[PDB]
């Protein structure tokens, strides 16, 4: 909350990443760029445990 | 610079006299009265180190004389509560950094 | 795309992995690839509360620093979770 | 003898801090670099809850009888890594960094 | 054996020894039943409201402080690990 | 007219104690004081004795 | 100030009212309250009691029951009844 | 905030002095004395002095009441949180 009021105070470089997302309802919803990182990290860490 | 330069330890240090309201079940005019009294109240008896008992001795007595007889006020770093209150008798405003102020009238 | 939907298929096919389950930010099942449904329903409800509770732990100590990856390790199983704001990926890998 | 391990833990590459807890919640021993008693009381309340919650949930809400948690590894932004183990009654929370953050910490020291 | 470990401690208990003993069990039962702190507060109030009637207010957390107006001989303040179960009835 | 007499009756107001307690400190035992350094320092030395 | 328990009710022990008018009164309230509840439809049960007093005893009874109130009233010799039941306190005085 | 009152006072024939002194006294009586019984002792004593005896008043935060009164002497108003009731009979 406190941080939200500081951004309002100082509107200098307003936070991007606008909520357009992927959407499409069904048949591959988002599953795309922040989540890709989480998928890639998960793969490696699954391998790590077996190796 | 701006938000990127600003770290938590810089943000807290930069500004202590900021004010931020979360909830507000109480009426618009009665908040203006209480908000001024609690801010001035805590800073007075903040002392060398913040006496959390001392803060809520002052706020309790002030809000008993100002409005009604059975007024209950608790402040803390962090906590969970469920509290049955009368209609338009409750304000929840936290002070900057690590101070959460719940005031209500039972 | 082949790239998310293939990597997710690859980690499932990978040996000694019980199943990968995507949780929605509102504690909902997007994809759930376990054997028995009771486990998948149980994992769908229980684990995303642990990750939110475990997010508040790292957050209290430093409210700039957010959870990137949580790994619990049980006696028989491991439980690995990669949380994001839109979705959370969960896996159960048996220890070698 | 029981102090030398605290000295042995800072010696491991990446290790910033450690904090040990009783079954109670009191911190037994902490590092001097991580805050003493102030943070050690704070960091106990979170992990003791996080542990007892997770300990509980795996035995009930996963419906797996006899499967107690051994380790918890909270990996974060920057390069922090909060490792929680349990030997007998007592528990502890080590904090390591990575090559990038270790190098940053060595440059800050320099 | 976790019930022997927690060993709930009672700093301030302005209440009869019989009613105090009941709070210890409920306090232990609340924590091992509940998944988060918000649920602990809710379980305590609801359990006491059923046993003894009226208007309870329950607060629990890591670090807080408490000046309050309560029904005399209905106020207990117990801390367990790092959780301070504070319940008080008002008229 | 019937001879009148006045009697006042008020409903028993439940007694309202006021008390102010901080929980900023961590969870110790009772016998041990959290502020006092001695009390804590000994209790830590009692745990390390296994 | 010293209360007392008689006929399953908590009355001011020095019974201001005559002990016949008091006994019949308390018993009617307990048999009224067994039907209508104070919490829901609390206005009705007062008006039932008020009319009952005027029938069996002298007229112009005033009836006042609440969980919390405080009154000083002028009444006739031996025509003042003040009793608690569970938590609710029932006042009434003839004029 | 006194949303619903019941005013059954004379008003006509300059008897507004006997309605206005209900709202006026109540405010002065409540803030000073701060005790439910002692309010009902103050308001009654005043209204007896000015407009002759046989007034009964009952002051409570929460109460039920059905009563007989003298037509155009009964007023029921909320002074702040508190709920004051006064009326003549006899």
XYZ file of C-alpha atoms in Angstrom:
689
model
C 0.000 0.000 0.000
C 2.800 2.428 1.146
C 4.765 1.675 -2.124
C 1.600 2.343 -4.258
C 1.316 5.901 -2.722
C 5.083 6.561 -3.468
C 4.565 5.656 -7.212
C 1.525 8.072 -7.254
C 3.732 10.783 -5.571
C 6.851 10.130 -7.797
C 4.499 9.518 -11.823
C 8.097 9.067 -13.232
C 8.514 5.931 -15.481
C 4.918 4.574 -14.959
C 4.846 0.720 -14.537
C 4.366 -0.963 -17.998
C 3.424 -4.693 -18.589
C -0.209 -3.626 -19.432
C -2.845 -6.354 -18.661
C -3.664 -7.396 -22.298
C -2.233 -10.889 -21.391
C -2.989 -13.691 -23.964
C -6.680 -14.456 -23.008
C -8.462 -16.590 -25.750
C -10.729 -18.249 -23.033
C -9.737 -21.920 -23.859
C -7.156 -23.772 -26.084
C -3.829 -22.332 -24.693
C -4.693 -19.415 -22.287
C -1.536 -17.301 -21.497
C 0.892 -20.305 -20.980
C 3.521 -17.757 -22.242
C 6.569 -14.442 -20.820
C 6.900 -14.625 -16.944
C 5.345 -18.184 -16.837
C 7.869 -19.514 -19.480
C 10.723 -18.616 -17.013
C 8.896 -20.623 -14.237
C 8.502 -23.636 -16.677
C 12.206 -23.446 -17.770
C 13.406 -23.165 -14.085
C 11.104 -26.143 -13.122
C 12.533 -28.395 -15.939
C 16.195 -27.739 -14.876
C 15.413 -28.237 -11.128
C 13.557 -31.561 -11.955
C 16.690 -32.750 -13.918
C 19.032 -31.449 -11.099
C 17.325 -33.835 -8.552
C 17.762 -36.963 -10.823
C 21.404 -36.039 -11.820
C 16.763 7.299 -10.177
C 13.149 7.660 -8.800
C 11.470 4.256 -7.837
C 14.554 2.171 -8.983
C 17.057 4.117 -6.736
C 14.500 3.951 -3.822
C 15.139 0.846 -1.599
C 12.973 -0.143 1.474
C 15.701 1.139 3.914
C 15.900 4.426 1.880
C 12.040 4.764 1.542
C 11.472 4.367 5.360
C 14.422 6.777 6.129
C 13.413 9.331 3.380
C 9.893 9.794 4.892
C 8.536 9.091 8.464
C 5.637 11.679 8.503
C 3.736 10.003 5.580
C 0.138 8.746 6.174
C -1.683 5.782 4.474
C -5.307 4.502 5.046
C -6.285 0.836 4.244
C -9.923 0.356 5.533
C -12.401 3.092 6.700
C -15.847 1.810 7.915
C -16.247 5.058 10.017
C -17.856 8.286 8.586
C -15.725 10.813 6.577
C -15.791 13.668 9.184
C -15.010 11.513 12.325
C -11.809 10.072 10.643
C -10.337 13.632 10.177
C -10.690 14.129 14.014
C -9.108 10.743 15.050
C -6.284 10.670 12.373
C -4.856 14.030 13.681
C -5.015 12.845 17.384
C -3.319 9.376 16.873
C -0.457 10.789 14.652
C 0.303 13.659 17.147
C -0.270 11.159 20.042
C 2.230 8.405 18.960
C 5.042 10.863 17.899
C 4.830 12.576 21.386
C 5.250 9.283 23.397
C 7.443 7.596 20.689
C 10.251 8.538 23.187
C 13.871 7.340 22.526
C 12.489 3.812 21.636
C 8.792 3.262 20.631
C 6.827 2.231 23.805
C 3.801 0.425 22.182
C 2.049 0.345 25.645
C 2.704 4.139 26.124
C 1.265 4.958 22.626
C -2.026 3.084 23.393
C -2.338 4.530 26.972
C -2.569 8.045 25.348
C -4.872 6.990 22.406
C -7.257 5.017 24.743
C -7.813 7.978 27.196
C -8.035 10.635 24.368
C -10.705 8.625 22.412
C -12.708 7.895 25.669
C -13.097 11.676 26.445
C -13.514 12.724 22.730
C -16.421 10.350 21.736
C -17.675 7.376 23.868
C -16.826 5.472 27.106
C -15.854 1.955 25.748
C -13.348 2.791 22.907
C -10.666 0.060 22.210
C -7.424 0.801 20.197
C -4.504 -1.652 19.435
C -1.246 -1.015 17.424
C 1.455 -3.508 16.284
C 4.126 -4.593 13.739
C 1.919 -7.495 12.470
C -1.195 -9.426 13.681
C -4.510 -11.135 12.734
C -7.895 -10.178 14.352
C -11.681 -10.638 14.044
C -13.501 -7.900 16.091
C -17.337 -7.387 16.397
C -17.989 -3.559 16.279
C -21.028 -1.181 16.061
C -21.848 0.472 12.648
C -19.526 3.416 11.634
C -17.284 3.002 14.769
C -14.031 1.540 13.212
C -10.886 2.978 11.469
C -7.847 0.853 10.346
C -4.849 3.064 9.276
C -1.155 1.899 9.437
C 1.705 4.457 9.955
C 4.857 4.349 7.696
C 7.232 1.319 7.909
C 6.246 -1.363 10.500
C 3.281 0.146 12.487
C -0.355 -1.137 12.097
C -3.025 0.945 14.004
C -6.550 -0.552 14.527
C -8.997 1.761 16.453
C -12.731 0.944 17.078
C -15.684 1.702 19.460
C -17.337 -1.404 21.099
C 3.567 -22.923 -29.747
C 5.364 -26.330 -29.298
C 7.658 -23.867 -26.547
C 5.802 -23.999 -23.121
C 3.394 -26.866 -24.122
C 6.419 -29.094 -25.198
C 8.682 -28.412 -22.116
C 5.604 -29.229 -19.900
C 5.123 -32.475 -21.974
C 8.931 -33.187 -21.651
C 9.083 -32.888 -17.772
C 5.988 -35.233 -17.512
C 7.575 -37.911 -19.830
C 10.849 -37.499 -17.775
C 11.435 -40.586 -15.511
C 10.742 -40.385 -11.687
C 8.096 -37.555 -11.923
C 4.554 -38.305 -10.561
C 2.882 -35.345 -12.394
C 3.024 -31.577 -13.203
C -0.058 -29.474 -12.169
C -0.677 -25.784 -13.177
C -2.602 -23.825 -10.445
C -4.489 -20.580 -11.361
C -3.897 -17.509 -9.055
C -7.507 -18.134 -7.725
C -6.627 -21.736 -6.553
C -7.979 -23.390 -9.769
C -6.701 -26.312 -11.967
C -5.682 -25.254 -15.561
C -3.788 -28.560 -16.307
C -3.506 -31.570 -13.878
C -1.513 -34.657 -15.022
C -1.427 -37.057 -11.968
C -2.552 -40.760 -11.846
C -5.306 -40.670 -9.104
C -7.723 -37.645 -9.021
C -7.872 -37.443 -5.135
C -4.105 -36.503 -5.092
C -4.640 -33.909 -7.942
C -7.739 -32.366 -6.176
C -5.803 -32.419 -2.813
C -2.685 -30.774 -4.457
C -4.965 -28.187 -6.233
C -6.409 -26.964 -2.842
C -3.558 -27.513 -0.287
C -0.189 -26.539 -1.969
C -1.090 -23.028 -3.367
C -1.990 -21.976 0.272
C 1.512 -23.194 1.445
C 3.127 -21.092 -1.399
C 1.098 -17.936 -0.428
C 2.008 -18.586 3.290
C 5.684 -19.226 2.214
C 5.575 -16.001 0.055
C 4.597 -13.965 3.218
C 7.668 -15.536 5.036
C 10.288 -14.295 2.445
C 8.292 -10.983 2.081
C 8.334 -10.027 5.851
C 12.204 -10.283 6.002
C 12.578 -8.059 2.835
C 9.406 -6.639 1.127
C 11.339 -5.869 -2.153
C 12.428 -9.566 -2.503
C 9.565 -11.810 -3.880
C 9.406 -15.682 -4.192
C 10.916 -16.925 -7.541
C 10.986 -20.721 -6.705
C 9.983 -22.879 -3.635
C 11.252 -26.502 -3.103
C 10.027 -28.583 -0.087
C 11.660 -32.064 0.446
C 9.623 -34.828 2.240
C 10.790 -38.316 3.445
C 9.632 -40.259 0.304
C 8.774 -37.391 -2.159
C 10.033 -33.904 -3.191
C 7.521 -31.042 -3.914
C 8.783 -28.220 -6.234
C 6.700 -25.069 -7.068
C 7.570 -22.160 -9.465
C 5.074 -19.393 -8.540
C 4.141 -16.435 -10.844
C 1.377 -13.736 -10.562
C -0.787 -15.164 -13.456
C -0.108 -18.946 -12.852
C 1.850 -21.313 -10.518
C 3.566 -24.545 -11.788
C 3.733 -27.486 -9.256
C 5.592 -30.879 -9.622
C 6.102 -33.987 -7.379
C 9.478 -35.782 -8.012
C 10.416 -38.972 -6.030
C 13.984 -38.704 -4.530
C 16.619 -40.991 -6.201
C 33.129 -27.403 20.029
C 29.440 -26.318 19.421
C 30.660 -22.758 18.417
C 33.162 -24.117 15.759
C 30.188 -25.268 13.531
C 28.856 -21.633 13.388
C 32.459 -20.675 12.282
C 32.402 -23.683 9.811
C 29.030 -22.464 8.319
C 30.208 -18.857 7.502
C 33.306 -20.572 5.896
C 31.028 -22.349 3.299
C 30.953 -20.280 0.030
C 27.807 -18.061 -0.252
C 26.737 -18.286 3.445
C 25.595 -14.880 4.812
C 23.692 -15.864 8.018
C 22.194 -18.697 10.132
C 19.486 -18.714 12.916
C 18.698 -21.788 15.138
C 15.294 -22.178 16.986
C 14.168 -24.362 19.964
C 10.832 -26.294 19.776
C 9.593 -23.115 21.623
C 10.668 -20.329 19.193
C 13.587 -18.647 21.110
C 16.704 -18.267 18.896
C 19.637 -20.344 20.370
C 22.526 -18.853 18.248
C 22.607 -16.457 15.213
C 25.354 -14.828 13.034
C 26.598 -11.247 13.858
C 26.015 -10.121 10.183
C 22.247 -11.004 10.322
C 20.594 -8.867 13.109
C 20.859 -10.360 16.668
C 17.646 -11.064 18.737
C 15.563 -8.327 16.893
C 15.404 -10.218 13.506
C 16.043 -13.613 15.281
C 12.665 -13.236 17.179
C 11.009 -12.046 13.870
C 12.508 -14.824 11.636
C 11.466 -17.505 14.250
C 7.721 -16.530 14.159
C 7.564 -16.970 10.323
C 9.555 -20.265 9.913
C 7.977 -21.962 13.043
C 4.515 -21.177 11.501
C 5.697 -22.081 7.903
C 7.150 -25.407 9.252
C 4.224 -26.443 11.593
C 1.734 -25.470 8.766
C 3.643 -27.540 6.100
C 4.410 -30.402 8.625
C 0.609 -30.531 9.275
C -0.553 -30.140 5.607
C 1.622 -33.018 4.154
C 0.247 -35.501 6.828
C -3.458 -34.474 6.252
C -4.273 -32.324 3.139
C -2.028 -34.467 0.783
C -3.599 -37.629 2.429
C -0.071 -39.239 2.728
C 0.174 -40.948 6.181
C 3.754 -40.994 7.683
C 5.663 -38.512 5.410
C 7.340 -35.734 7.532
C 9.112 -32.786 5.746
C 12.968 -32.858 6.024
C 14.085 -29.634 4.160
C 12.496 -26.385 2.735
C 14.459 -24.223 0.153
C 12.824 -20.762 -0.448
C 14.667 -19.330 -3.537
C 13.954 -15.630 -4.226
C 14.790 -12.461 -6.266
C 18.439 -11.137 -6.062
C 20.194 -14.444 -5.032
C 18.852 -15.160 -1.434
C 18.169 -18.877 -0.591
C 16.413 -19.721 2.755
C 17.185 -23.409 3.682
C 15.103 -24.850 6.645
C 16.113 -28.297 8.116
C 15.211 -30.086 11.429
C 17.555 -32.253 13.599
C 15.553 -33.594 16.611
C 13.567 -30.833 18.432
C 15.700 -27.863 17.146
C 15.453 -26.308 13.600
C 17.464 -23.584 11.700
C 17.395 -21.127 8.720
C 20.690 -20.643 6.753
C 20.890 -17.850 4.068
C 23.279 -18.374 1.062
C 23.944 -16.238 -2.078
C 25.089 -17.149 -5.672
C 28.290 -16.309 -7.679
C 26.734 -12.990 -8.909
C 25.684 -11.855 -5.350
C 28.885 -13.318 -3.687
C 30.943 -11.261 -6.248
C 28.710 -8.179 -5.452
C 29.269 -8.749 -1.651
C 33.107 -9.092 -2.165
C 33.116 -5.838 -4.285
C 31.063 -4.068 -1.502
C 33.652 -5.336 1.094
C 36.387 -3.971 -1.297
C 4.500 -35.029 21.145
C 4.027 -31.489 19.551
C 1.454 -30.607 22.337
C 4.275 -31.143 24.959
C 6.714 -29.005 22.822
C 4.519 -25.839 22.277
C 3.892 -25.669 26.120
C 1.640 -22.540 25.965
C 2.733 -19.775 28.451
C 0.295 -17.289 30.132
C 1.915 -13.873 31.004
C -1.335 -12.087 32.098
C -4.557 -14.042 33.012
C -7.264 -11.956 34.822
C -9.559 -15.064 34.904
C -10.439 -18.088 37.166
C -7.955 -21.073 37.134
C -10.689 -23.451 35.724
C -11.574 -21.140 32.729
C -7.777 -20.536 32.162
C -7.075 -24.350 31.838
C -9.845 -24.556 29.122
C -8.094 -21.734 27.090
C -4.723 -23.675 27.039
C -6.371 -26.724 25.302
C -8.435 -24.515 22.856
C -5.240 -22.430 22.149
C -3.227 -25.640 21.320
C -6.220 -27.195 19.397
C -6.648 -23.907 17.378
C -2.998 -23.789 16.073
C -2.692 -27.522 15.051
C -6.184 -27.296 13.340
C -5.539 -23.936 11.515
C -3.398 -23.337 8.335
C -2.907 -19.501 8.822
C -2.992 -16.848 11.648
C -6.295 -15.216 10.395
C -8.017 -18.656 10.904
C -6.631 -18.921 14.540
C -8.381 -15.647 15.634
C -11.688 -16.821 13.989
C -11.627 -20.333 15.641
C -10.944 -18.958 19.214
C -13.750 -16.279 19.218
C -16.369 -18.703 17.699
C -15.464 -21.491 20.244
C -15.703 -19.123 23.316
C -18.875 -17.281 22.013
C -20.585 -20.772 21.962
C -19.304 -21.753 25.502
C -19.788 -18.270 27.134
C -22.151 -15.813 25.325
C -21.671 -12.064 24.510
C -19.268 -9.910 22.384
C -15.662 -11.346 22.269
C -12.775 -9.628 20.330
C -9.757 -11.942 19.554
C -6.289 -10.726 18.287
C -3.163 -12.930 17.588
C 0.209 -12.178 15.873
C 4.044 -11.855 16.064
C 4.535 -8.250 17.391
C 1.652 -6.029 18.725
C 0.408 -4.172 21.865
C -3.030 -3.884 23.471
C -4.820 -1.218 25.634
C -8.511 -2.340 25.837
C -11.768 -1.960 27.899
C -13.086 -5.472 28.878
C -15.701 -7.211 31.129
C -13.718 -7.613 34.445
C -12.675 -11.316 34.865
C -12.898 -11.873 31.026
C -9.326 -11.097 29.729
C -6.397 -13.547 29.096
C -3.058 -12.864 27.265
C -1.096 -16.079 26.450
C 1.872 -16.366 23.996
C 2.808 -19.790 22.433
C 6.053 -19.990 20.374
C 5.657 -16.499 18.761
C 1.761 -16.295 18.748
C -0.035 -14.156 21.443
C -3.717 -15.308 21.676
C -5.450 -12.195 23.206
C -9.279 -12.593 23.758
C -11.531 -10.127 25.720
C -15.363 -9.763 26.086
C -16.987 -6.239 26.217
C -20.482 -4.887 27.163
C -55.058 9.694 46.214
C -52.726 6.757 47.187
C -49.498 7.694 49.125
C -46.579 7.670 46.597
C -42.883 6.658 47.158
C -39.985 6.913 44.602
C -37.452 4.071 43.990
C -34.591 4.333 41.413
C -33.362 1.093 39.719
C -30.428 0.869 37.223
C -29.314 -2.312 35.342
C -25.879 -3.570 36.649
C -23.241 -2.110 34.246
C -20.551 -4.848 33.696
C -17.176 -3.624 35.137
C -14.761 -2.239 32.500
C -11.064 -2.932 33.280
C -8.435 -1.082 31.132
C -5.006 -2.806 30.550
C -2.118 -2.152 28.056
C 0.304 -5.042 27.162
C 2.956 -5.284 24.339
C 3.893 -8.594 22.539
C 6.868 -7.134 20.526
C 9.054 -9.626 22.532
C 9.331 -13.290 21.388
C 7.867 -16.343 23.210
C 10.036 -17.331 26.235
C 9.029 -19.317 29.341
C 7.287 -17.625 32.337
C 10.105 -18.000 34.972
C 12.495 -16.312 32.419
C 12.241 -12.498 31.707
C 12.579 -11.512 27.977
C 14.050 -7.972 28.648
C 16.644 -9.056 31.328
C 19.846 -10.284 29.532
C 20.941 -12.525 32.501
C 17.641 -14.552 32.527
C 17.900 -15.281 28.724
C 21.722 -15.889 28.756
C 21.453 -18.662 31.441
C 18.403 -20.352 29.768
C 20.374 -20.581 26.440
C 23.335 -22.126 28.446
C 20.827 -24.628 30.040
C 19.657 -25.824 26.531
C 23.366 -26.444 25.511
C 24.099 -29.313 28.013
C 21.978 -33.258 23.878
C -29.085 -3.274 45.763
C -28.919 -6.864 47.241
C -30.849 -9.169 44.779
C -32.374 -12.643 45.544
C -33.671 -15.724 43.581
C -37.393 -16.652 44.137
C -39.749 -18.448 41.635
C -36.882 -18.994 39.103
C -36.291 -15.186 38.858
C -33.723 -12.635 40.235
C -35.721 -9.886 42.138
C -34.661 -7.035 44.524
C -35.010 -9.005 47.853
C -36.845 -6.306 49.903
C -40.017 -6.768 47.792
C -41.344 -3.174 47.273
C -44.651 -4.617 45.862
C -46.960 -6.947 47.917
C -45.736 -10.598 47.661
C -49.018 -11.844 45.993
C -49.014 -9.179 43.163
C -45.230 -9.922 42.688
C -45.613 -13.784 42.506
C -48.503 -13.660 39.947
C -46.597 -10.938 37.972
C -43.194 -12.768 37.573
C -45.045 -16.070 36.761
C -47.048 -14.343 33.912
C -43.815 -12.833 32.389
C -42.094 -16.309 32.520
C -45.256 -17.845 30.833
C -45.335 -14.894 28.318
C -41.546 -15.300 27.580
C -41.990 -19.118 27.093
C -44.207 -18.071 24.056
C -42.827 -14.724 22.611
C -38.998 -14.029 22.684
C -37.418 -10.651 23.765
C -34.796 -10.707 20.911
C -37.524 -10.926 18.153
C -40.878 -9.036 18.617
C -39.976 -7.473 22.038
C -42.585 -4.618 21.850
C -45.533 -7.139 21.748
C -44.711 -9.008 25.054
C -44.603 -5.671 27.049
C -48.105 -4.639 25.751
C -49.395 -8.194 26.633
C -48.046 -7.818 30.242
C -49.265 -4.153 30.656
C -52.917 -5.113 29.758
C -52.693 -8.236 32.063
C -51.793 -6.068 35.147
C -54.818 -3.719 34.531
C -57.165 -6.816 34.416
C -56.064 -8.637 37.657
C -54.755 -5.539 39.627
C -55.456 -1.728 39.759
C -55.115 0.244 36.459
C -52.361 2.483 34.914
C -49.342 0.123 35.252
C -46.129 1.304 33.470
C -43.931 -1.597 32.093
C -40.167 -1.163 31.306
C -37.806 -4.127 30.543
C -34.381 -3.917 28.828
C -30.883 -5.493 28.794
C -29.522 -2.021 29.873
C -31.367 1.055 31.314
C -31.598 3.243 34.475
C -34.797 4.925 35.832
C -35.951 6.898 38.941
C -39.814 6.777 39.105
C -42.565 7.783 41.638
C -44.976 4.854 42.411
C -47.800 3.987 44.903
C -47.206 2.219 48.306
C -46.298 -1.475 47.602
C -46.698 -1.128 43.766
C -43.080 -1.456 42.440
C -41.682 -4.756 40.939
C -38.035 -4.957 39.613
C -36.653 -8.447 38.672
C -33.850 -9.883 36.439
C -34.438 -13.128 34.397
C -31.307 -14.693 32.731
C -29.845 -11.259 31.628
C -33.016 -9.099 30.952
C -34.260 -6.837 33.845
C -38.065 -6.139 34.084
C -39.278 -2.912 35.871
C -42.989 -2.014 36.365
C -44.858 0.381 38.768
C -48.601 1.234 39.322
C -49.923 4.882 39.294
C -28.103 9.997 15.001
C -31.796 10.347 16.163
C -33.247 9.176 12.767
C -36.757 8.303 14.190
C -38.320 10.184 17.205
C -41.970 10.306 18.494
C -43.144 13.893 19.405
C -46.629 13.955 21.106
C -46.263 17.341 22.965
C -48.842 20.206 22.866
C -46.782 22.705 20.706
C -49.882 25.013 20.295
C -50.770 27.655 23.007
C -47.066 28.586 23.775
C -46.360 25.104 25.316
C -43.251 24.709 23.007
C -41.349 25.852 26.195
C -42.343 22.359 27.580
C -41.149 20.473 24.393
C -37.901 22.522 23.755
C -36.838 22.047 27.458
C -36.951 18.231 26.728
C -34.236 18.492 23.972
C -32.343 21.292 25.894
C -32.140 19.565 29.360
C -31.363 16.087 27.876
C -28.134 17.414 26.182
C -26.901 19.197 29.406
C -27.988 16.263 31.678
C -26.300 13.426 29.625
C -22.792 14.965 29.035
C -22.300 16.073 32.723
C -23.802 13.258 34.897
C -22.809 10.247 32.654
C -24.965 7.672 34.601
C -28.350 6.331 33.268
C -30.207 6.437 36.677
C -28.908 9.997 37.522
C -30.162 11.332 34.087
C -33.742 10.087 34.891
C -33.370 11.881 38.315
C -32.276 15.254 36.709
C -34.730 15.515 33.704
C -37.724 14.447 35.928
C -36.800 16.968 38.735
C -36.680 19.870 36.157
C -40.000 18.990 34.363
C -41.720 18.617 37.803
C -40.395 22.094 38.907
C -41.744 23.944 35.816
C -44.879 21.979 34.629
C -46.100 20.426 37.957
C -45.620 16.845 39.251
C -46.373 13.179 38.209
C -43.756 12.989 35.352
C -42.007 9.577 34.851
C -38.846 9.388 32.623
C -36.693 6.266 31.839
C -33.217 6.524 30.144
C -31.479 3.450 28.577
C -29.110 2.514 25.685
C -31.342 -0.535 24.800
C -34.851 -1.121 26.351
C -38.478 -2.112 25.456
C -41.432 -0.161 27.033
C -45.282 0.051 26.713
C -46.909 2.678 29.045
C -50.037 4.852 29.779
C -49.535 8.709 29.619
C -51.530 12.020 29.559
C -52.311 13.019 25.891
C -49.863 15.729 24.575
C -47.206 15.279 27.378
C -45.155 12.294 25.938
C -41.871 12.794 23.942
C -39.312 10.111 22.841
C -35.964 11.446 21.442
C -32.381 10.097 21.023
C -29.804 12.415 22.732
C -26.629 11.223 20.872
C -26.282 7.402 21.327
C -28.611 7.325 24.432
C -32.467 6.991 24.115
C -34.399 9.234 26.623
C -38.200 8.807 27.250
C -40.309 11.181 29.496
C -44.130 11.610 29.919
C -46.841 12.744 32.417
C -49.447 10.435 34.082
C -51.805 11.719 36.862
